[PDB]
Amino acid sequence: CPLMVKVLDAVRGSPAINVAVHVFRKAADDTWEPFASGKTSESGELHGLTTEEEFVEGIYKVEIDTKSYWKALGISPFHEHAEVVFTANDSGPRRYTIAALLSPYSYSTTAVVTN
Amino acid sequence: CPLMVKVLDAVRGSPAINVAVHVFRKAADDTWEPFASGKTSESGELHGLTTEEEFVEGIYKVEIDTKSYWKALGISPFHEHAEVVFTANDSGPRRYTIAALLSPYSYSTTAVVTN
Amino acid sequence: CPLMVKVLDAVRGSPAINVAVHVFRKAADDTWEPFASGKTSESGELHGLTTEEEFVEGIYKVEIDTKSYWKALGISPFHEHAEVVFTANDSGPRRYTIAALLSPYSYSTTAVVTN
Amino acid sequence: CPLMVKVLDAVRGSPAINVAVHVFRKAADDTWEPFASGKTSESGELHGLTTEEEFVEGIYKVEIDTKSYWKALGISPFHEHAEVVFTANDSGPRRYTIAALLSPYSYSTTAVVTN
Ligand SMILES: O=C(O)CCO/N=C/c1cc(Br)cc(Br)c1O
Numbered sequence A, B, C, D: 001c002p003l004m005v006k007v008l009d010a011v012r013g014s015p016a017i018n019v020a021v022h023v024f025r026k027a028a029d030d031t032w033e034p035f036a037s038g039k040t041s042e043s044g045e046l047h048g049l050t051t052e053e054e055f056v057e058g059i060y061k062v063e064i065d066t067k068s069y070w071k072a073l074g075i076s077p078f079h080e081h082a083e084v085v086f087t088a089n090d091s092g093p094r095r096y097t098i099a100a101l102l103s104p105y106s107y108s109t110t111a112v113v114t115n
């Protein structure tokens, strides 16, 4: 699994479950093309978005739909979504974990990159 | 001043100076139209981007050029940029400060919305 | 002013107002001795804790009473307090700003060290 | 396993490996007594600190030795350590994951608490 997403909720101290995630890849004409999508599980994780073969070099955007998550908990948050944009596999294949820690008016995102 | 940006460097414990910042407004055709831009000051701040008159309700994006910042420091970064996407709302407080705390493989962003 | 504290609330997107903050110095017997304290202002800031004359090199602890802050908002928190422990050094810049970004089950802290 | 620690490095985008962790528990005389200790693994994780039987209600302090970690990478960081202080098991047994994301002049810590 070369691209994984993990989302945590900093208000509740829990995984952020059922968070929609959309992944896009920049095309040769410089526009964002759909690449994969899914929803976080009960553990706040999203696996199985892509394969090593499909996950070629490129610029990828991982959009985490945080606004819908908070609205469903009764909270009107600040951001529309959290966007994570990065070049992938430009020095050969890697495994990426994109993690996000969510609060209504703040989020943090990190990447863990392994061989 | 209704919209300010503050950028900090978590590696050096300092303001992030001379970071390019672009602000976009979402247009009716769903595309991002340039709105304002600048470079952070020696205090890591960018003021004077817009006026109360111009900063009407809508969806805005603040794009912080983090990749060029880390490249100048000789540190290999993960993200192409940091993106902050939000709705400006007239029902809340009048000043929006978008703050970002930068590391090579991580960033945090918060919104401080005050009167 | 060589030591300042700034506290933000990531749930409300606001300064964290009226938060108690205690500063301690490590004594020669390795115990923490009270040094200075106060409550954050309406801007979430606490200034005037010490002077350049008093703020000699040593190990200091800044304890932010986050539990009482969340209790006042009716939100169940995880931590008893946030603790920031550091060595003050005369070889670096002269002003230390200890910033903290608070959520019920998470906090971030950074140091902005400037001239 | 009711108490786990996970540490990430925000500069390198990797687990923080070989980080020393000391856990203390407040005794009836209000002093911190040693409770458990260990080091993070190649995955940045520390398991096996305690058992459900031993991990009774109390106030616990998890001290993550961040300064030694950074010094070994050639970096002189700001903090002496990251301290996480919390009441545990006061509404029955729970499972706690204490996570920390490290940068030289900043860290964030969250808790994931499960039944
Ligand atoms: O395994 C679990 O239950 C959660 C532990 O993983 N933590 C991830 C994580 C932690 C912090 Br602190 C900041 C960011 Br951004 C993260 O993505």
Ligand SMILES: O=C(O)CCO/N=C/c1cc(Br)cc(Br)c1O
Binding pocket: B008, B099, B100, B101, B108, B109, B110, C006, C097, C099, C100, C101, C108, C109, C110, C112
């Ligand atoms: O006075 C200064 O120099 C700036 C201090 O403000 N801190 C802001 C801030 C702190 C943390 Br922790 C995380 C995020 Br995101 C922030 O935006």
